[PDB]
């Protein structure tokens with residue numbers, strides 16, 4: 001009825017600061033991105049003006065605040081989401097190491113598991129990826145909240161297409177020069193499916209990924225994030241021994257930090273958009289689902305509770321006519337439907 005689902009992975013961001021913990025409102029303050037097609041300015045992260053079109057129920061919180069982390073784990077329990085997929089940027093700073101330890105300890109108190117979402121950090125390549133996979137498994141592999149499926153850790157790899165299949169083969173083929181296959185550091189490696197099947201099918205096969213995900217909460221942003229393609233993507237995956245983990249989300253809007261990106265807006269329609277994405281994932285017959293996102297406030301994809309808020313700087317969007325915790329409860333509903341279908 002209410003147990004956590006360990007085939008549901010929710011993308012989680014630990015880059016927020018507060019004056020209480022960090023001494024600064026990190027990420028609530030954020031540079032405005034220049035138009036790809038310029039002195040754009042910065043959102044200052046004051047109470048009135050934050051880097052989101054929405055406004056958190058918990059305010060300008062710190063991701064290093066143990067009291068905030070506790071409340072977040074309670075929110076995961078409400079949503080029935082059993083795995084927290086943690087953004088990881090290879091910052092190599094004491095604050096990063098501290099935050100990962102706090103998140104693991106908080107998660108374990110509510111039986112939530114943690115896996116890593118490997119980001120496009122500077123000069124990312126298959127050698128430093130191996131070195132960082134080994135570090136992460138050695139440092140956190142014995143923590144009880146560290147996620148495993150059939151004895152293997154799992155990693156999502158954002159913008160995996162930035163590395164050529166001839167490089168991925170070295171790490172992920174059983175014969176690869178620096179392979180993790182059949183070693184103590186073997187893992188499930190889930191790459192990002194973006195574009196058409198004529199490009200993606202050979203990429204995934206040649207790179208030796210164990211599976212693929214789609215990430216984007218905005219329908220139609222890519223081929224992969226267009227749900228009418230998911231039945232055929234699942235059929236191809238099952239035929240080729242690959243795990244398909246489609247990404248579902250409640251909406252998208254990023255125009256505070258990207259004022260030129262309005263065409264990517266997807267409206268929430270009081271939950272109906274989320275319902276349509278989640279239904280299509282379940283209908284495709286997949287064995288795992290990813291949620292974009294718990295708390296990407298910059299991109300307006302969050303299921304974390306939000307509240308009404310107005311200032312002279314900006315009038316924020318909010319969840320009305322639904323209540324602030326609607327997207328947590330609606331997640332729990334769809335987790336129930338997914339479990340019926342497995």
Ligand SMILES: OC[C@H]1O[C@H](O[C@@H]2[C@H](O)[C@@H](O)O[C@H](CO)[C@H]2O)[C@@H](O)[C@@H](O)[C@@H]1O
Nearest residue numbers: 011087117119120158215257296298299
């Ligand atoms: O939204 C601003 C944010 O964009 C980039 O991070 C990416 C986004 O969070 C989103 O597309 O998800 C990706 C996978 O988790 C992630 O790479 C970065 O440029 C970041 O610094 C920025 O704050």
Ligand SMILES: OC[C@H]1O[C@H](O[C@H]2[C@@H](O)[C@H](O)[C@@H](CO)O[C@@H]2O)[C@@H](O)[C@@H](O)[C@@H]1O
Nearest residue numbers: 036159194216221222254258261264299
């Ligand atoms: O430029 C806006 C766009 O930025 C990010 O996506 C970029 C890249 O990371 C993606 O792999 C490709 C997919 O086609 O698009 C961009 O180049 C995301 O933050 C995205 O949500 C945003 O719209």
Ligand code: NA
Nearest residue numbers: 006007008149
């Ligand atoms: Na699982």
